Structure formats: C-alpha cells, structure tokens
C-alpha cells in the first residue's frame, strides 16, 4: 500500500531509531561507526555511517541519541532515543499541556515533551546546522521511537523554515499536542512528517483524545503482526486528522506491538 522506495526509507529510519537504544551509540567518538548489538541496525551498518554528535541524559528529559552522517544515502540524521524503560514510562506519563505560540499560534504541546526539546534545542540546532553547511547536498532527517519520535516531531516543527528541509520519521510516537498543533503539523512546509504506527500499539493512543490531544495526518499504519516481517503491502496510509481506521481504534491496546516496528526496537542494551 506504499511504494518500495517509501518502504525502504521507513525501514531505514526504524533502524536509526533502534540504534539510539544501544548505549555505545550515546557517548561515542565523532567519526566512529554506528553499530548495534543484536543485529538491530544492519542497514545503518551497510552505509558508511558515523557519529557527528553523541549525547546521553541531556538537559531536562534525559535526551539521549546521536547525530549521524550517512555518505552512502547522503543524509544528516538526528536520532532521538525513547525511554530506557518504556513500560515504566507509559504508566507514569502525565497528560499536562502547555502553550507553544513559539511554534504555532493557538497551539498547545505536551509540557514534558516540549520542555525536554527546549532544553537541548540550541546546541542540537548548532550541530545540525554545521553538518548542513558542510554537506549542503545532504538531506536532513529527524527520527525516533516512542518518546524519541515525539522529540523528533517537535524538534522538526521547531527547526524547519531555516534554509533546509527536515523530514521526520516517528515510530510508535505518542500524541504531542492539541488540535491546532496537529493541524499545524499536517500542513507545515519545509519537510514531511512520516508518522508510523503498528497495529494496536498503546503509545500512539496516549495521551487520550479526552485530554485535548489530537494526532496529525496522515498516518502510516503497519498491519502485520508482532514478530512478523513487514512488506510494502502491509503499510496502509490513513488520512485525516484524528482519523480512525489505523491505530486509533476502540479495541484493547498492546505493549509488545510497540516494540516491533520492522523488527525489534527499544530493546538494544
């Protein structure tokens, strides 16, 4: 239901997202190679991919991940890790909103997600910008899983419009703000958000719509099961803000479904 090229980008940024959970990838020497224990990121390894920047327990919400260089694919990749204990994080997640007129007028964002990005935003922008002037033909890509896919999206909405486009690939990301924010994220130019969800993963169902949260459109929804290899016929593109039909269905959600986006994700030590 999506093109093969789109499947391959989807597949490739899942593995970048996965690679941010391995502890070696959070405090590594720049110019060094991005690798994963457990075969979590073979596509990244197949490209000549090295650390530009490396960060662990940064600022306000322990922002962890890496800035990568990909010469084979010609990419500048900002990858944010999700929580080191997802189950604990799902259960303690607050639904508190805050206004973010900085980004867009009338818009509100999750206080936790918003603040955490704000914490590390200046530095990380410097680091991306330096890569851009240095590799001006390279494409900027922000990505992440779980709480990292939220950070990617928010950082993507924040940094766009500065001379370079920014695509965002998020895997099992929670909702990130109210309706005006979701609307804003749907139409914003200067890059494309590819919001990826798996079957009945809980995380994209929080915070609840009852607390004033909405999801941007479109939605790329993976219909193949947990531990089941994904093909391109298993990803259906679901349009419309707050649409039903993909992840947002009235049925009982699941945790293991969150940890299977093309292969294992969030379990790299």
From Swiss-Prot:
InterPro entries hit by this protein: AB_hydrolase_fold, AB_hydrolase_lip/est, Fungal_lipase-type, Mono/diacylglycerol_lipase_N
Pfam family, any one: Lipase3_N
Assigned keywords, A-Z: Cleavage on pair of basic residues, Disulfide bond, Hydrolase, Lipid degradation, Lipid metabolism, Signal, Zymogen
Activity's thermal dependence: Active over a broad temperature range.
pH dependence: Active at alkaline pHs (up to pH 12 approximately).
The keyword Transmembrane is annotated on this UniProt entry: no
Any GO BP: lipid catabolic process
Uppermost EC category: hydrolase
Disulfide bonds: 22-268, 36-41, 104-107
EC number, UniProt record: 3.1.1.3
Top-level taxon: Eukaryota
Cross-referenced Gene3D superfamilies: alpha/beta hydrolase
Family: Belongs to the AB hydrolase superfamily. Lipase family.
Protein's name in the database: Lipase
Higher taxonomy: Eukaryota, Fungi, Dikarya, Ascomycota, Pezizomycotina
């Amino acid at each position: 239901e999506v093109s093969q090229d789109l499947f391959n980008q989807f597949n490739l940024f899942a593995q970048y997202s996965a690679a941010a959970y391995c502890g070696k990838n959070n405090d590594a020497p720049a110019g060094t190679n991005i690798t994963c224990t457990g075969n979590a990121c073979p596509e990244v390894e197949k490209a000549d991919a090295t650390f530009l920047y490396s960060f662990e327990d940064s600022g306000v919400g322990d922002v962890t991940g890496f800035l990568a260089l990909d010469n084979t694919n010609k990419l500048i990749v900002l990858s944010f890790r999700g929580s080191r204990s997802i189950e604990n994080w799902i259960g303690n997640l607050n639904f508190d909103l805050k206004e973010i007129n900085d980004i867009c007028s009338g818009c509100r964002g999750h206080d936790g997600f918003t603040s955490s990005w704000r914490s590390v935003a200046d530095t990380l922008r410097q680091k991306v910008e330096d890569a851009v002037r240095e590799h001006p033909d390279y494409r900027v890509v922000f990505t992440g899983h779980s709480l990292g896919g939220a950070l990617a999206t928010v950082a993507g909405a924040d940094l766009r419009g500065n001379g370079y486009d920014i695509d965002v690939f998020s895997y099992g990301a929670p909702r990130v703000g109210n309706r005006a924010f979701a609307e804003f994220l749907t139409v914003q130019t200067g890059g494309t958000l590819y919001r990826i969800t798996h079957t009945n993963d809980i995380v994209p169902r929080l915070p609840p719509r009852e607390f004033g949260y909405s999801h941007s459109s479109p939605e790329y929804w993976i219909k193949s099961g947990t531990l089941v290899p994904v093909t391109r016929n298993d990803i259906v593109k679901i349009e419309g803000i707050d649409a039903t039909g993909g992840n947002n269905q009235p049925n009982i959600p699941d945790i293991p479904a969150h940890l299977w986006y093309f292969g294992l994700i969030g379990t790299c030590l």
